[PDB]
Structure formats: structure tokens, C-alpha cells
């Protein structure tokens, strides 16, 4: 059932809506420390892999949450004003 109340009103359907606002939030929070795009092309994918069920849903979430934290724990620690390459100037460079 629904997070029926004492005073039944027009409560349509409080899951699939809190849910999509849920997962958008986290999208959001997501996609504004990590501007990729990618997070777009992993849902067309998991539209052939589960078919966007709320099971890939959440799973890419926690996947994407996870592959974040990893970069976002190295970012608050480590300075990386885009120092993806090992070093700032060309890779290996001397004793690689």
C-alpha cells in the first residue's frame, strides 16, 4: 500500500513520483561536481541491460555514487586543478 494517512485525500501515488525526485536529486548533485554527460548514455545502456527498471535505476546510482566518492575523496585531499595526466606538463617526463 501507499503512505496512507488518517484523512485519505487524492494521493496519487507518493512512490514513482518521491522516487524520480529522489533518484533526480541525486542526479543532480551528481552531474554538478561531475559535468560528463556520461551519467545520460549509462541509462541508454541499462535501458537495454534491464529495461530502466527501478532495480538498474538505483543500481546505477549507487554504482555512479560510488565511482564518485572515490574521485570526490581524492578531490578533497588531493589539489587536482585537472591533473588527470600523472603529470602536469606530459607524462612520465623523468623517473615515470
Known amino acids: 500500500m501507499e503512505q496512507a494517512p488518517e484523512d485519505q485525500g487524492p494521493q496519487r501515488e507518493p512512490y514513482n513520483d518521491w522516487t524520480l ?45 560510488q565511482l564518485l566518492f572515490i574521485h570526490f575523496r581524492i578531490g578533497c585531499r588531493h589539489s ?8 602536469r606538463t606530459r607524462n612520465g617526463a623523468s623517473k615515470s
Open 21 to 65: 525526485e529522489l533518484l533526480e536529486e541525486l542526479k543532480n548533485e551528481a552531474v554538478r561536481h561531475f559535468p560528463r554527460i556520461w551519467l545520460h548514455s549509462l541509462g541508454q545502456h541499462i535501458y537495454e541491460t534491464y529495461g530502466d527498471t527501478w532495480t538498474g535505476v538505483e543500481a546505477l546510482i549507487r554504482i555512479l555514487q
Open 80 to 87: 587536482r586543478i585537472g591533473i588527470i595526466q600523472q603529470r
